[PDB]
Amino acid sequence: NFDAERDALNIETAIKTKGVDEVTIVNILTNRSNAQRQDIAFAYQRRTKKELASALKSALSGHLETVILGLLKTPAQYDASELKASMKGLGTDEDSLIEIICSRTNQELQEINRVYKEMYKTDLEKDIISDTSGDFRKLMVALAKGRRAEDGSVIDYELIDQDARDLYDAGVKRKGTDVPKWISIMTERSVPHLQKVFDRYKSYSPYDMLESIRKEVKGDLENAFLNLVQCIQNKPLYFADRLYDSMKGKGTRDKVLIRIMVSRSEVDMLKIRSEFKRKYGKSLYYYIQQDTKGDYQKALLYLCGGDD
Numbered sequence: 001n002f003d004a005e006r007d008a009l010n011i012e013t014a015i016k017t018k019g020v021d022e023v024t025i026v027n028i029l030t031n032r033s034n035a036q037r038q039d040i041a042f043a044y045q046r047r048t049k050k051e052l053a054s055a056l057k058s059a060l061s062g063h064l065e066t067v068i069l070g071l072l073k074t075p076a077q078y079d080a081s082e083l084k085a086s087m088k089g090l091g092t093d094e095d096s097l098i099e100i101i102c103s104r105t106n107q108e109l110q111e112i113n114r115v116y117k118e119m120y121k122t123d124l125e126k127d128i129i130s131d132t133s134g135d136f137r138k139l140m141v142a143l144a145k146g147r148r149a150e151d152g153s154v155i156d157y158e159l160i161d162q163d164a165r166d167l168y169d170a171g172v173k174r175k176g177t178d179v180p181k182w183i184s185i186m187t188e189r190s191v192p193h194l195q196k197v198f199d200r201y202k203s204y205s206p207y208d209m210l211e212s213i214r215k216e217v218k219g220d221l222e223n224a225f226l227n228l229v230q231c232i233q234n235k236p237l238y239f240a241d242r243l244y245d246s247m248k249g250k251g252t253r254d255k256v257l258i259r260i261m262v263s264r265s266e267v268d269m270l271k272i273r274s275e276f277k278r279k280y281g282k283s284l285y286y287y288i289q290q291d292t293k294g295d296y297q298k299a300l301l302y303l304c305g306g307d308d
């Protein structure tokens, strides 16, 4: 059914329509997979000899432009560009750097590292170093390598118990904190293993892993650990909470809302929606509908994939 040549022609017609037909552009692009959007971009240049991204940047504006241009990038290109943006200047937007590095898998990070180097002619690790310091830097650099252990064929209960005790003895039990121990265990063990470790951890500490972090460390280091533990425990819930935070109260933190809707639309949006509804009462669709307007709202609601 999909025909990149047909979609490209219709988009060209919309772009050249007096006043620009943003609706048609949104109706098409937010209802095509990332791979299909790539096919559409190639078809567009094949037909017009002009680049689709450039054409749309000129035709669109505001938040809608941000969403559409984001959707046109491959997943790795989008993440790489978002990382670059987070470290721009003094890299004050540590929250975004943390969101991406803490939530991406080994496979995703491998491609991100490759693409980042191709796009910016520099190692992602080097820019991360420039935008981080102390143990926060050590944690972020370790995570960005995307070398977390593979899932084992058999559950290692003795190791699970061992890691749980080490996490306790390294933090809540002693004065100060053995941060390197925390970094090693939380970056090197597989996610399923760590989920069990954090559960077993409750047998040694009166505070769960998250509260232990709030009591042991502070600043960006603390936020990085909190974000990482949430992604390990329940990634869809992690994104649901970030989405809620991006819309709660006056205004909207579009940078976060847009990035999550674009980057997770084809990954785990159904689960994100389920967790969102379960925790906040209203559907993600409802929150988006209430926090945004026009074609921008339309685009985000299509990426949401439906109401709950």
Ligand SMILES: [Ca+2]
Residues within 6 Å of the ligand: 019, 020, 021, 022
């Ligand atoms: Ca228009």
Ligand SMILES: [Ca+2]
Residues within 6 Å of the ligand: 056, 057, 058, 059, 060, 061, 062, 065
């Ligand atoms: Ca523009």
Ligand SMILES: [Ca+2]
Residues within 6 Å of the ligand: 170, 171, 172, 173, 174, 175, 176, 177, 216
């Ligand atoms: Ca301590």
Ligand SMILES: [Ca+2]
Residues within 6 Å of the ligand: 246, 247, 248, 249, 250, 251, 252, 291
């Ligand atoms: Ca709001």
Ligand SMILES: [Ca+2]
Residues within 6 Å of the ligand: 251, 252, 291, 292, 293
């Ligand atoms: Ca808004």
